[PDB]
Ligand binder design. Structure first.
Ligand SMILES: COc1c(F)c(F)cc(C(=O)O)c1F
Ligand SMILES: COc1c(F)c(F)cc(C(=O)O)c1F
Ligand SMILES: [Cl-]
Ligand SMILES: [Cl-]
Ligand code: NA
Lengths: 301, 301
């Protein structure tokens, strides 16, 4: 028993991390088969980042303009190409430590592990949720760009995120591994802010199931409710609407505890209205919304 | 910026994890050079749970009673010995993935990464602290025994914990890698319970310094305290005594922020008296005590 924010084991990804340098800019690359993926903004000087023309800046450069280092070994760059906001560098050598992998795009509410990296060196790992406003609440310093987010399904690593920038509120923005931004963001030094965020309703209910599975049961009650009724309370508290798809994904947890989702929604309803009454749930004073139903089932059995 | 419960990259530990079987009992082991370390209670059977005589149970085993498995490979055990509560199994092969390692016994308040493993396969990674009552608040199901806790400071893996058992209150007890328990616990199913736990005072202050570095000042006050007056107030909230050693260790964080340790101590006294009044600190509505001064400087500016 016990319940913790838990990252995937990060070794399959540590084996793919390289350092990429172009001029004065150093950041991280992902080395899979014979290609190194990194953010395209690596080709920009400071001046360039105010209004960058990436087509024009890029056709200027050549393969030998890119220094790729896997530990203490220079990789030879024999090709370079842009795909959306991600730069692809072909190299003479396939990564002998390439795992089974695919590129995947995640939905808001879904979680992934981030391998925070500096100068190509894995530094730390933590779990994040793609916020409804398409930011993540990460921990990144200068040199972290090109750090990546991933899930593991059996032996296959699904890469879903690459780090590009920090916003003024201290939250973070990036792309999938095909260079498409999550959220209404651009890779340029201009004025950008996160939309107002909402709470991931189905994740809070998953976390309450986790509490109950772990003998934390005070918040429970004899009451039940309806989607319509709860959703009117939800919208009032900047909670995501709860759908019949969400209720169906929580089925297993509703079974394993004998508390029905609207049974549990009744508990969440009263927690938003009344508060926590000086108590904690799983050692938090907040309603935690960064555990998916999968996360709970995976960790608890 | 940002601030996250962040674990060490687990790859160097992943390539060390194996499955150990004895009788009907399977748990995890740690393969470094030609030695596999696991909890000694692997040799216990159905009746040997209450008062196992380990010297008697071990002398009756040959090397071939131990079935050790690195994924698909069956290692051959060629030797066996007990050191305190750890079994040390010699095998005919050094682990090719053995990294630079060392064993260290930690003190209460110290943090580490846990690589949770089932059947020798890594399941996830998370950060824990050694509580003042010598337990950890982990996430461990049946089969996790032999999972290890570690730090990775400057490419060397310091092993500091091996998981042995869950106590009746849902908290976790284990040994250093020399097989000596943290706390007054023993590898028997006799009734045991942890001492009253206390908040890790030095770590709360380190986290408040983290909040200030990340631009939060709302909880500071114009007051200071003596170290003695601070301790008389702090022990009434079940906080650990703050020692001169703790004050010295905060010196660098004091320096970076321009806030004296005893000033920050007055802020802590006030937060304990008022609560948060619907505010949060680094995304928590509680005072977090599982980040050390070292962890705050690692993750921060
Ligand atoms: C005969 O009494 C015992 C006993 F002392 C013991 F440690 C374990 C068992 C058991 O079968 O689980 C048992 F029956
Ligand atoms: C899961 O196996 C057990 C177990 F049930 C138990 F009560 C105690 C120990 C131990 O090492 O002290 C153990 F490994
Ligand atoms: Cl452009
Ligand atoms: Cl220590
Ligand atoms: Na209910």
């Amino acid at each position: 028993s016990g319940f913790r924010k838990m990252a995937f084991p990060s070794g399959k990804v540590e084996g793919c991390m390289v350092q990429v340098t172009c001029g004065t800019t150093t950041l991280n690359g992902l080395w899979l088969d014979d290609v190194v993926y990194c953010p395209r903004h690596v080709i920009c000087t400071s001046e360039d980042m105010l209004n960058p023309n990436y087509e024009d800046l890029l056709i200027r450069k050549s393969n030998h303009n890119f220094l790729v280092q896997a530990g203490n070994v220079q990789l030879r760059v024999i090709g370079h190409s842009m795909q959306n906001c991600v730069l692809k560098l072909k190299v003479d050598t396939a990564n002998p430590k390439t795992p089974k992998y695919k590129f995947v795009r995640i939905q808001p509410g879904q979680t992934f592990s981030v391998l925070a990296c500096y100068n190509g060196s894995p530094s730390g790992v933590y779990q994040c949720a793609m916020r409804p406003n398409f930011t993540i609440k990460g921990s990144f310093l200068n040199g972290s760009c090109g750090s990546v987010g991933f899930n593991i399904d059996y032996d296959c690593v699904s890469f879903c995120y690459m780090h590009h920038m920090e916003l003024p509120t201290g939250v973070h923005a990036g792309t999938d591994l095909e260079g498409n931004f999550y959220g209404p963001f651009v890779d340029r030094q201009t004025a950008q802010a996160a939309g107002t965020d909402t709470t991931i309703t189905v994740n809070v209910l998953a976390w309450l199931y986790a509490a109950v599975i772990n003998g934390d049961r005070w918040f429970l009650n004899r009451f039940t409710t309806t989607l319509n009724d709860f959703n009117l309370v939800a919208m009032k508290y900047n909670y995501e609407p709860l759908t019949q798809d969400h209720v169906d994904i929580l089925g297993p947890l509703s079974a394993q505890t004998g508390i029905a989702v609207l049974d549990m929604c009744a508990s969440l309803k009263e927690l938003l209205q009344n508060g926590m009454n000086g108590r904690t749930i799983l050692g938090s004073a907040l309603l935690e919304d960064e555990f998916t139903p999968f996360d709970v089932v995976r960790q608890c059995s």
